[model samples]
Target chain A: QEKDWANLQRYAQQNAELPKPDKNEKRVVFMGNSITEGWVNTHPDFFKSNGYIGRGIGGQTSYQFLVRFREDVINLSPALVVINAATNDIAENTGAYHEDRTFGNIVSMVELAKANHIKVILTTTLPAAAFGWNPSIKDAPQKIASLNARLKAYAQTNKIPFVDYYSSMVSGSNKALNPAYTKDGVHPTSEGYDVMENLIQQAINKTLR
Target chain B: EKDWANLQRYAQQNAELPKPDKNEKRVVFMGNSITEGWVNTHPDFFKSNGYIGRGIGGQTSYQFLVRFREDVINLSPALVVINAATNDIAENTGAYHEDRTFGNIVSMVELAKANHIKVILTTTLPAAAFGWNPSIKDAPQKIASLNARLKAYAQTNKIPFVDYYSSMVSGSNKALNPAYTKDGVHPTSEGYDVMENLIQQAINKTLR
Candidate 1:
């Protein structure tokens, strides 16, 4: 879990202005649901030179994110934006009745960033063994895989960069975030973020052109 | 009433657009409370431009239309802007109902035109999602349907119409779509863009 910097806006006004470049340093924002939220409190050195801004709100669906994207993404003015939401939304953050609104919201966020000239990084919702919901309405594993497949296809078709957590974080069977990485089978442990940090760094090294 | 005159403000600013050169050119703003509230912002404008604000908070279109002939017709106006019915969705003043709100608005249109006053129908602004309701179930499709009905009515009758719903309201859900609004429904400066643009469009279409 990251330091609960609850209202990301407490950092600034009307929008969060990224810390000014110390010596031509670039500012990148890790914008997502919750995975990226932990990085701000846990990962500091990564942000020092990279000027990383962690702005992932917990349990937020892309629909809610789209509602607040202007406050988080548009207002921040980051150089490259990494989007890592869509799981809880699939789990039904509003009331558990999953709807296509989350996917639609994701599409709007992507379009909004492209219009603003911010480089985009889209990631698959981390593999879940089962839902952490009240009714235990577990999303079918095969269906989760299918949705991830569609998400990856969308990324490639759009020519945007895609990060594959499924390939690396999943167990040999590739159905979930290995118990080593997550206890609740949803959120990542420090090791899980460590794996994520390396993958994200590799993508960043590629320059996300 | 003197209290009414004392409440309005600088004439040119409240209407939120440039004043017409002739005082005979008239506009009627039909709202509940906020319109009454804004009248205080433009007292002279209403006097100089022959504008009439017939807004009684807690009174829906049902109550307003009941008294329309006397309040709206007695003081002849060239145009009318209707901005009630939201509270009707909640049946705020009476039964927390939404049925007659639409019909009442349509009836008001025929009544206005019968008196030669053009009608501009506006969609209600987005709700705060939580206020005035136990569930944040703000009106989205209901609003869309009403706005569509009003739009079609205006087009069919060739009467000027104002859309306060699409321009000021949030998404399909009806909470001020966040970016252009502040309090979700009441309209923070940006939300007014929707109302202002509609007024301009109506004027442009009519003057032409």
Candidate 2:
């Protein structure tokens, strides 16, 4: 309770040694939960090829993300940040979940980014039917839709590029992830990342433009 | 654990009410113990003046910013008076950095403005020492510096700056005048009386 309020320890040392961006580089950071914590290792080349950085930690909600926004996203001085999150908040990873609070948290991050003069690419939460870990309560898909709609509208109103993976990755009827896209309903596998790679690249291109 | 993230402290009443009447002229006071204690001790002032007090005890600017939407903006107030950061300087929450604390307040102000709520950023009441946490020796200097930043930001942003420190402090000590404050941190009724007069003036000026 008395430790890092902003979770400075999460990226303290990495932030110290990471060099500033090269002149031609459009340095970006990926911020999210296990989905992102796993993305870099699952497909190391996805980040390394673009010289990007990943600042995700497993089992964290939007509250934790806002707390560490400055140290992880702002301090890195990236030209852009792709925020792919909200699955854990729906899963109640931190506590009882509310869509509006999660929405506020994401908006707060976006505001912080704008304040720091960084471009943003807001991403949709990958489609999921249910959390294998929390099976009793269902209807994860609609919850994701509610939050994604918010992310999309904000990106559009602000004219920031939005990466819409949900439209491409959801199974028929959109209640679940296309099983071919993910091993677990909540986490993307190599096949899922393959689909996401193209979607994100399009968003990155638009953001860099 | 399940409830705190969304800040349920003062939102239940807020959730039940609709927007204020055309002339209720709602103004929300956002802060820590000082504001909370003010409402608790001086109930008539809030009720009669149509002001909403949304202060939680021992809160830093971090918690205030986190709860700003639900507690402050959602209330649909015409104006918000922000008096926070004393707990940040005292390390009440955890580590304290002046810039982060300042940033948190600015974030709250930004959200308020986005929601069409005007803002009045208040200076922290003067404090030379923490009565509860004695090891913090440089509180007076830190308080002064943070106030300076808050004042400069208010001027730059065209918001009202409420100067509670100078009017309520003992000059040589840089601490809350015992004549006005009760614990050197939390103010007495008289202390709040002094602040309220100044706050009302600021509120009137902004609402004009």
Candidate 3:
């Protein structure tokens, strides 16, 4: 019954209303699921001050991200895109989490970005012991780690800057999100994003500099 | 309900398919029913030429993109003949947005190129209207605009463009030639034969 499978309409109006970046603007667009969407909501000034755009939709997987990457990221003509995805993929939002499929979708996004001259910043999914919405997935931590490892390796190989939010946000022993950084195991709290903002800003500065 | 894009459709077959031999020139035809019908109507052409068909009925370019890595990239085909846009124009999955459909094709092409696969981009087969979705009053114009963009993209990228539309379209109405199609949307065996000739030439030229 859902007409917009990827929910491309989520950001269509905002994308259109957004004026093109000026010559000096180092526009960075954050492309992801709820985690990324939440960032803009929690800390709007972070995006507003830096001239960054958040094109994330809640409950979306990497497949959906790839579907709308052109309209969201490329057409906006950002100088860079910070890709944080695959959390919902592991939660089986679209379907079973075939690692190859999820990974390939991310790779496709990166390829599309590079082809369009958008520098990419890859990030590890924030540590989550389990998805509260979908409790059936028990191995959330392992899957996140596996995906992050692959993402880190890809970023290193491609010489793309990698942001490691997982290492900074995870609690020891359980591999769950640190209590201080999250209320739910899945999404980061404002305190948690405070940490992410620092790490991502560093990467952005290092890359765009 | 679980597998929205139908990645499960080709999972087992893709796994069962043996990796291409070091020198084998494997080609994959990626699309909706038109490409599917081609393989069914002329199985020998695919087998004899080491071509693989990865079409599913009622798929749009969006779905093709979701499964592209699994079906086409995982097969390790040397070349991919991408035929898409019909189901997209039909609005099978959702509303038809030309840029979204066109972007999906571009994403597939970028994915293939990233993985070292050469590409053959095909125009959507001629169709005056879809039988299942007659509500779409202007499918011909949609098809024309989509094909024109596709042809231009193919030319700009220097990828091979196989124009099935030009060869299979009839009079002023721009419907599928009566000789090539029983339905206005899908191609017949003779239609497949015509596509086979044009695509064979493209494959030969591209893989050469």
Candidate 4:
């Protein structure tokens, strides 16, 4: 933690030396852990015209994301920031039931965006069935359920809309990307993104317009 | 100059680091460019008075007020500050209306204390009959008027004031005492020593 801030002095001195994007283009940003990092080339149509920015950094847990929030979100100053993260909490990639801590981080990102007057939206984690990458978590159905329940409850209680891909993508007791929508049991397939694209477009026009 | 920007970055980063006053007395610095450069003895007074800074660079009264508008009331961390600065217009350093800067700085200083920040009024520098500081237009009468304004304002306002000019004394035309400074303008180490003594007396009055 002490050494993490040493690079900031170098970053600040480069302020006037950095490049700025040209005007007249609508900017939509996607940020989070790896899942959102995978969204860039996977969904070209929705991203092609919007000058969409891929701000995702791979292998990051929400704990790491909060530390970089100011640089990744606030300084970008985009018209809207879309965050799709939190599945790592249930995966327990770190061997902890960190869902509560993860939720608190998400709320901080939302407030930071509000402070800068940037519109914010959350993307529900795409449901997962079992982890092929790790065997003991072979049946994560219960853990995934509890996490999604919290996301839905939060959205309702706070009146903050969440684009729920889980309810739409899950199958009987399993939520691996629909067979037609995924090549591997993990990550999205082309058809998987089609579902997300239509839902996000409708949400953007309705809320942002 | 680039180093100045780097220090600002260091400051910006340290902005989040804990700066606990730890129950220490605080003194804010509210002045024009003269006060900006004169106070070299810092981290000393900083530890002593728990100082907060609000000085703008190359700013006459015009841009000085421009800055206070945004940053003035943001922090209630300070209860008082050392105030001494002018257009240095008599020095004609920057091309502002020399006559008006005296009134302008006093007005800003008054409002500062109204926000409960006590002010230490200070005089304009004693002017030389010849052009000196980097700026080449000298107006000794302008210096006298400004010093008079600062003293009268301090007395009328009943604030503790220090006279740098009265003590900078030593010339036929009433310029610097030459023994203390060669330029007849900026203070030398000895010249600063004299001003320091006056400031200490004024501060002792307030603190004791």
> Highest lDDT, which number?
3
lDDT of 4 by residue, A105-180 (tens): 5665665566566787777777777656556676467766676788778777766668887777877646565676
Clashes of each: 13, 0, 0, 2
For residue B58, what is the lDDT in candidate 3? 88
| Shift of residue A22 alpha carbon in model 3, Å | 1.0
Interface RMSD of each: 22.5, 2.5, 1.8, 18.6
Candidate 4 residue-wise lDDT at A164: 80
- Candidate DockQ values, in order, are 0.03, 0.38, 0.67, 0.02
Q: Where is the poorest 10-residue window by lDDT in model 4 chain A?
A: A1-10
The C-alpha stretches of model 2 lying farther than 4 A from their native spots are: A16-25, A115-117, A172-174, B21-24, B171-173
Which scores greater on DockQ, model 1 or model 2? 2
lDDT score, candidate 4, position B47 = 41
> Model 1, range B1-208, lDDT digits (tens) per residue?
1111111232233335443443455676777765664455445645754666777655555555534544554446667788876656545544433334565676567656655667777666556453555453646655566667767877887766666655555444556678764445455445544555667577547644
Relative to the real complex, the DockQ score for model 1 comes to 0.03
TM-score of predicted structure 1, chain A: 0.84
Q: Model 2, B1-208: lDDT tens per residue? A: 5644338777578888788874778999999989999999999999999999998888888778778878887788999999998888889877778877887888787777767889999898899888777889899889999999999999998999999999988967698999997678888989989998999999988887
Q: Which of the predicted structures, 2 or 3, would earn the higher lDDT when compared with the native?
A: 3
Tens digit of per-residue lDDT, candidate 3, span A47-161: 9999899998999999889878899999998999999999899999987887878888888899999988999999998888888899999888888899999899998999988
| lDDT, model 2, position A155 | 88
For candidate 1, the per-residue lDDT at A22 reads 56
Local distance difference test values of all predictions, in order = 0.61, 0.85, 0.89, 0.58
Task: Write one digit per residue (lDDT tens) for candidate 4, span B1-63.
Answer: 112111232235234534335254445555554455555534353445455556544444533
